[PDB]
Write an enzyme that holds these catalytic residues in place. Structure first.
Site, PDB file in Angstrom:
ATOM      1  CE  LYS A 298      16.410   8.700   2.927  1.00  0.00           C
ATOM      2  NZ  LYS A 298      16.599   7.675   1.864  1.00  0.00           N
TER       3      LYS A 298
ATOM      4  CG  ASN B  34       7.461   4.483   7.451  1.00  0.00           C
ATOM      5  OD1 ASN B  34       8.386   5.216   7.101  1.00  0.00           O
ATOM      6  ND2 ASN B  34       6.923   4.540   8.663  1.00  0.00           N
ATOM      7  N   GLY B  35       9.377   0.786   5.945  1.00  0.00           N
ATOM      8  CA  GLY B  35      10.173  -0.141   6.727  1.00  0.00           C
ATOM      9  C   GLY B  35      11.670   0.075   6.644  1.00  0.00           C
TER      10      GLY B  35
ATOM     11  CD  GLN C 173       9.340  -5.580   5.376  1.00  0.00           C
ATOM     12  OE1 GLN C 173      10.031  -4.942   6.171  1.00  0.00           O
ATOM     13  NE2 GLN C 173       9.643  -5.683   4.088  1.00  0.00           N
TER      14      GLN C 173
ATOM     15  N   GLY D 101      11.598  -8.226   1.565  1.00  0.00           N
ATOM     16  CA  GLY D 101      11.430  -7.229   0.530  1.00  0.00           C
ATOM     17  C   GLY D 101      10.033  -6.636   0.530  1.00  0.00           C
ATOM     18  CG  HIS D 102       9.544  -3.396  -2.093  1.00  0.00           C
ATOM     19  ND1 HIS D 102       9.334  -4.161  -3.219  1.00  0.00           N
ATOM     20  CD2 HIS D 102      10.606  -2.602  -2.370  1.00  0.00           C
ATOM     21  CE1 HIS D 102      10.236  -3.850  -4.134  1.00  0.00           C
ATOM     22  NE2 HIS D 102      11.021  -2.907  -3.643  1.00  0.00           N
TER      23      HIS D 102
ATOM     24  CG  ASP E  68      12.876   6.765   0.071  1.00  0.00           C
ATOM     25  OD1 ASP E  68      12.035   6.110  -0.583  1.00  0.00           O
ATOM     26  OD2 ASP E  68      14.108   6.623  -0.076  1.00  0.00           O
TER      27      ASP E  68
ATOM     28  CE  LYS F 160      19.482   8.180  -6.740  1.00  0.00           C
ATOM     29  NZ  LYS F 160      20.928   7.915  -6.979  1.00  0.00           N
TER      30      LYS F 160
END
Ligand SMILES: Oc1ccc(/C=C/c2cc(O)cc(O)c2)cc1
Length: 483
Positions: free
Chosen positions: A90, A77-78, A157, A185-186, A216, A375
């Site tokens: 988002k 959710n970042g 994060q 990054g994730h 998303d 997207k």
């Protein structure tokens, strides 16, 4: 220290900023890799195709509710809606009937806690950009989640320093010091879970499975069959993959490779096959033709991941409290919109790359409904239309009349790449797309109330620059609409 002056400056900067030690530890290990001259290349000769995998469609057995009682749902959710003209989170974009991505996830988690497992956990990995908006959103709509937001739900994060391309020092930007830091990054999920102590808290509380997915992605829902598959086949890391199409040939792909591990301490040496991912930045120039052969490498990562938390803890404990993932060397300027600002590296990792770090790792082929990200505003238009319906357990699926195929939407750059243009297009109503095979819209267009589209529809406006509205109640069938 044996650390270079550049690496020590990075340590000093992160120390001064109160960055937790597990992040500094992991980042410095990446800095050394970069400073050694690591190319990170993955040629076709170091890799082999996957060939055959199991399929979710072919599975039937569900797990019992006791497994869900030991499961954590974690949503990435970042990210902001920048790719759609949205400078906020988002997952807070409306998708259906006033419900956002975050609504459906929370309502799905609520349905499961009411009917299956009250102890199922829900977590959110936020960035500094999305934290306050998410907390404020939950405070208004889901108070039970807000009550435990700081203590249980939120995973923050990390941010790591951007480093100069020539000397690898922590870059400096007096005009905006925030531009000196960047998310890693994730792949940072493992570092954040360990460093924050939450991974150890989850394991000692008895939680055994974590399902991670993009916030998303509306298709990434809990499927009890996947949990049964892992319990039966004894899997520590399962990755959901989909078959690559021609539009996916630029994206990463799953691959196999064979490794020989020199035995540490007194135990013998080990040879074994592992799974891994390869994206374009890692593929050598000469192998790019093979990289895009969707018949050779036919699967791509959906970022729908299922992980055994006790095994992840042991693995990270075996590596000094980190998880060594391949580093992506993002080359930007410290202000990416200022072409004259210092050139920098932004070190990043992908959470799907961890599949190579587990002995009992596997991948499964899932239908593309489980990989349904929004997207474009075209994707958003189809979802808000009646072509999609909400199930009783708060899943978003196609209406039966679509017969498994969603209406294609092609919308013009002019006006609609961003939400601001798209918002006027549906100002007084959203057109019915349940029967439309394909809609292209060229130029500026506005919709009226109660509109219906059927078959293949095109609506072009040849640079009129004027209003171009469509009346209320009109229905276009297999036609092209001009002024
Ligand atoms: O509910 C469902 C929704 C979608 C589908 C089609 C899935 C599919 C799966 C792949 O691996 C590749 C692909 O191009 C499509 C099947 C069932």
């Amino acid at each position: 220290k044996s650390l270079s002056a550049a690496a020590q400056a990075c340590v000093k900067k992160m120390r001064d900023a109160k960055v937790n030690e597990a992040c500094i530890r992991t980042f410095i290990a990446q800095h050394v890799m970069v400073s050694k001259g690591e190319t990170g290349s993955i040629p076709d000769s170091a890799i082999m195709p996957v060939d055959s995998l199991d399929a979710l469609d072919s599975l039937t057995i569900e797990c019992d509710n006791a497994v869900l009682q030991s499961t954590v749902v974690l949503k990435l959710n970042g990210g902001l809606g920048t790719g759609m003209g949205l400078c906020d989170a988002k997952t807070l974009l409306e998708v259906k009937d006033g419900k956002t991505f975050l609504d459906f996830t929370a309502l799905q988690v609520q349905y499961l806690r009411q009917h299956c497992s009250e102890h199922l956990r829900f977590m959110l990995m936020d960035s500094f950009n999305t934290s306050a908006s998410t907390k404020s959103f939950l405070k208004a709509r889901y108070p039970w989640l807000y009550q435990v937001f700081d203590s249980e739900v939120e995973l923050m994060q990390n941010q790591v320093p951007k480093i100069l391309q020539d000397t690898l020092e922590p870059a400096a930007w007096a005009e905006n010091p925030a531009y000196e830091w960047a998310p890693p990054g994730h792949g940072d999920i493992y570092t954040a879970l360990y460093g924050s102590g939450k991974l150890q808290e989850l394991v000692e509380q008895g939680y055994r499975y974590m399902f991670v997915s993009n916030g998303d992605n509306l298709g990434a829902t809990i499927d009890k069959r996947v949990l049964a598959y892992m319990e039966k086949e004894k899997i520590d890391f399962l990755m959901e993959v989909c078959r690559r199409t021609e539009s996916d040939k630029k994206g990463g792909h799953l691959a196999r490779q064979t490794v020989y591990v020199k035995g540490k301490d007194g135990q013998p040496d080990a040879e074994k096959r592992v799974l891994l991912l390869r994206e374009s930045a890692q593929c050598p120039k000469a192998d790019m033709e093979s990289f895009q052969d969707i018949n050779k490498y036919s699967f791509f990562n959906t970022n729908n991941l299922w992980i055994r938390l006790p095994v992840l803890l042991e693995t990270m404990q075996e590596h000094g409290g980190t998880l060594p993932l391949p580093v992506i060397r993002n080359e930007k300027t410290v202000d990416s919109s200022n072409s004259a600002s210092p050139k920098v590296y932004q070190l990043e990792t992908a959470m799907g790359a961890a599949i190579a770090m587990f002995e009992s790792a596997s991948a499964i082929v899932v239908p593309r409904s489980r990989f349904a990200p929004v997207k474009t505003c075209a994707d958003l238009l189809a979802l808000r239309s009646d072509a999609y319906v909400v199930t009783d357990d708060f899943r978003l699926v196609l209406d039966d009349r679509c017969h498994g195929h969603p209406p294609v939407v092609d919308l013009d750059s002019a006006h609609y790449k961003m939400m601001n243009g798209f918002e006027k297009l549906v100002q007084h109503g959203v057109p019915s797309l349940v029967e439309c095979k394909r809609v292209t819209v060229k130029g500026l267009v506005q919709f009226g109330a109660g509109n219906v589209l059927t078959g293949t529809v095109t609506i072009e406006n040849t640079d009129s620059a004027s209003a171009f509205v469509i009346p209320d109640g009109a229905k276009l069938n297999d036609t092209t609409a001009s002024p």
